[PDB]
């Protein structure tokens, strides 16, 4: 439930490799890549204190709330821990609404898949 974050970097062969970590008690997320990088990966979980799930950007703080917002809203709806990896170029806010609506449609049609 309690999230901690870490990052580190290393020169391996002739390239800078960048690592991000998210630690929960029973789960670990390891991300390997380059720096700089996009910060489009989030996790949210239902707090038992508030009705609003706490959403964290796993790849470093960002002011873009697309992934954190989606994760939070889906965690609210499903009552489980939700990771979102949002890999779309098009960050028009209306496009994101279309995407979110499509996800909700799938959840209505196939609740057992979520």
Residues in contact with Cl ion by the rule CB under 5 A: 15-16, 63
Least gap, CB of 19 to Ni ion (angstroms): 8
Least gap, CB of 65 to its own copies (angstroms): 14
Least gap, CB of 64 to Cl ion (angstroms): 7
Say whether residue 51 binds its own copies (CB under 8 A). Answer: no
Angle of helix 66-78 relative to helix 93-109, nearest 10 degrees, comes to 20
Buried b or exposed e, range 70-106, using 16+ CB within 10 angstroms: bbbbbbeeeeeebbbebeeeeeeeeebeeeeeebeee
Say whether residue 15 binds its own copies (CB under 8 A). Answer: yes
């Amino acid at each position: 439930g309690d999230v901690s974050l870490h990052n580190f970097s290393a020169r391996l062969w002739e390239q800078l490799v960048h690592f991000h970590v998210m630690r929960l008690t029973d789960s670990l997320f390891l991300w390997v890549g380059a720096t700089p990088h996009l910060r489009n990966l989030a996790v949210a979980m239902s707090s038992r204190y508030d009705s609003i799930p706490v959403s964290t950007s796993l790849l470093g703080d960002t002011s873009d709330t697309t992934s954190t917002g989606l994760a939070q809203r889906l965690a609210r709806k499903t009552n489980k821990q939700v990771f979102v990896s949002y890999n779309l170029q098009n960050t028009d806010s209306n496009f994101a609404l279309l995407v979110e609506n499509r996800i909700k449609e799938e959840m209505e049609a196939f609740p057992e898949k979520f």
